[PDB]
Amino acid sequence: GSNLGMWKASITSGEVTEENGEQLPCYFVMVSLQEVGGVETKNWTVPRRLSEFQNLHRKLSECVPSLKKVQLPSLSKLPFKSIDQKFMEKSKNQLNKFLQNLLSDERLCQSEALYAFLSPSPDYL
């Protein structure tokens, strides 16, 4: 089964990537799992796209309605509507705290949706 329990996630830096001639917002997420004293605590960082963040909120919202109260940032796939520093920060603040709400809820804490998002999965949905 899944050996979860206490997971810590947070953003450290943010950058914008490029794909198919389009720029998308990317926010690095540092996940740390403190296992039994016998094992050493693990810690890694993985880039998370805005779209991914929302995908999780939807999956989590189903398990917890309270989460529905939380609102995440968004953007458009327009040529002029590019990602700027202003949004990179304004959104980062919403994402940084967004994760906290997930680890703050015991229901979500065990929710696979979290462990899956916290894990290094670029194809996450």
Contact 31, 9 (CB under 8 A): yes
Q: Residue 85 is encoded by which pair of tokens?
A: 């520093």
| Residues β-bridged to residue 47 | 28
**C-alpha 60, offset from chain centre:** 12
HSE-up of residue 21 (Cα within 13 Å, Cβ side) = 3
Q: Residue 119 is encoded by which pair of tokens?
A: 């894990």
Distance CA 52, CA 48 (A): 7
Could you tell me the residue range of the domain that residue 33 belongs to? 1-125
Distance CA 17, CA 24 (A): 6
Method: NMR
Q: How many domains does the chain have?
A: 1
Distance CA 121, CA 12 (A): 18
